Design a protein around this ligand. Structure first.
Ligand SMILES: Cc1cc2nc3c(=O)[nH]c(=O)nc-3n(C[C@H](O)[C@H](O)[C@H](O)COP(=O)(O)OP(=O)(O)OC[C@H]3O[C@@H](n4cnc5c(N)ncnc54)[C@H](O)[C@@H]3O)c2cc1C
Ligand SMILES: [Cl-]
Length: 385
């Protein structure tokens, strides 16, 4: 008996950003979440996320990253919660052997991004505590950095609610009923209707998009991070130790300097367990690889950051087959917007994605170029159910 203008299902990284954008414009919005964001059951916890701009994954990503960066600076000004610290982001790998490094370097050139290029011992000299072989090269982006991701969602929620958005917590959406002129969601706490729907359920998109007659390969992965006791004279943000994402022969790792003595945090990017979001084991350390894959990197490349484990977390990626996002209207329903498959690299864009989703919901179009995120693209291996 309350009709909304827009309902957002899944008020996490993408949905809460969309909620803020909609509320800002006086759009009557309901956000429904299975938990109470920010929380520790989805893809947004573990405190910190890298934002970088030299995005070799595709041209379309660079302006989205730069717009998102400006939106994060705006958010910083709007809230009391801490949003962004400009740690810089270091990318390294073996010379001539890392597509990730090469693509990052190409992206910086193509978009005239401000970066430093260094190699071998220059890396170890600039950032004491890093020990790479002489045949490694690097590209450092001084103006990118680290987002406090739980703070971001909390701030967007507070601002959205202040403007009149309603947030229904601890409420799982179980089904959808879509009409030419309205949308309906079904939950154990009641059913709700609106003119438009945004669907942004994170790892649960892989289970519930079938309720919208969609059959899209989406695989959730269990991805752990650990915080380690570190040499603070080397690895502290206070001594300019950078965020990093790097490629070594056995994969990609990412991490964060120690903030206020929390310890250096590390994740292994290219490996995780295939899981179901409803049965995933969210306890860190239950597989020996959780800790050992991290320490194998640290002892080789960041040896003074390989101390006692201070904290672990268990988070999820949701991968598409091509590892590009899905941001598009539902092919059968122009009043339904889908945001899915962020493939372990979506958080930095979540501010810009909130803007895109807002535009798609209200106008059926966006000013951003999102062509590479089309739900109809062949590399998805997608169709209707
Ligand atoms: C360990 C780790 C490190 C990462 N590091 C980075 C990084 O450094 N840089 C970067 O850009 N990205 C990073 N990412 C990726 C980024 O965090 C994700 O791409 C992004 O958070 C996905 O956002 P989302 O809104 O799709 O999912 P979420 O933020 O998980 O939001 C989905 C929401 O949907 C809700 N929901 C689920 N089912 C229902 C239902 N049936 N009804 C109602 N609500 C429902 C959930 O409760 C949740 O709140 C990392 C991810 C992980 C796991
Ligand atoms: Cl993801």
């Amino acid at each position: 008996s309350t009709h909304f203008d827009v309902i957002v299902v899944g008020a996490g990284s993408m949905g809460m950003a969309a909620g803020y954008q909609l509320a800002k414009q006086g759009v009557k919005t309901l956000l429904v979440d299975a938990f109470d964001p920010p929380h520790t059951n989805g893809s947004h916890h573990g405190d910190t996320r890298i934002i970088r701009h030299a995005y070799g994954e595709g041209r379309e990503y660079v302006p989205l990253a730069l717009r998102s960066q400006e939106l994060w600076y705006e958010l910083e000004k709007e809230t009391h919660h801490k949003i962004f610290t400009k740690t810089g982001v270091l990318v390294f790998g073996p010379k001539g052997e890392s597509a990730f490094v090469a693509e990052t370097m190409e992206a910086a050139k193509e978009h005239s991004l401000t970066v430093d290029l260094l190699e071998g011992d220059e890396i170890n000299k600039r950032w004491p505590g890093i020990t790479v072989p002489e045949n490694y090269n690097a590209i450092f982006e001084p103006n990118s950095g680290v987002l406090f991701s739980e703070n971001c969602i909390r701030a967007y929620r507070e601002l959205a609610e202040a403007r009149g958005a309603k947030v229904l917590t601890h409420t799982r959406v179980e089904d959808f009923d879509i009409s030419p002129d309205s949308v309906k969601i079904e939950t154990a706490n009641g059913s709700y209707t609106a003119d438009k729907l945004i669907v942004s359920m994170g790892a649960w998109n892989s289970k519930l998009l079938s309720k919208l007659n969609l059959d899209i390969p989406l695989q959730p992965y269990r991805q752990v991070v650990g915080f380690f006791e570190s040499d603070e004279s080397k690895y502290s943000n206070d001594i300019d130790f950078p965020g990093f994402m790097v490629e070594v022969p056995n994969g990609i790792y990412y991490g964060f300097p120690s903030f206020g003595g929390c310890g250096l945090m590390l994740g292994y990017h290219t490996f995780g367990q295939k899981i179901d979001p409803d049965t995933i084991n969210r306890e860190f350390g239950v597989y020996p690889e959780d800790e050992s894959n991290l320490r194998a990197f640290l002892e080789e490349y960041m040896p003074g950051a390989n101390g006692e484990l201070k904290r672990g977390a268990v988070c999820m990626y949701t991968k598409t087959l091509d590892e590009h996002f899905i941001i598009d209207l539902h092919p059968e329903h122009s009043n339904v917007v889908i945001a899915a498959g962020f493939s372990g690299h979506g958080f930095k864009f979540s501010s810009g994605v909130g803007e895109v989703l807002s535009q798609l919901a209200l106008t059926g179009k966006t000013e951003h170029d999102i062509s590479i995120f089309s739900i109809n693209r062949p590399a998805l291996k997608e169709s209707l159910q």
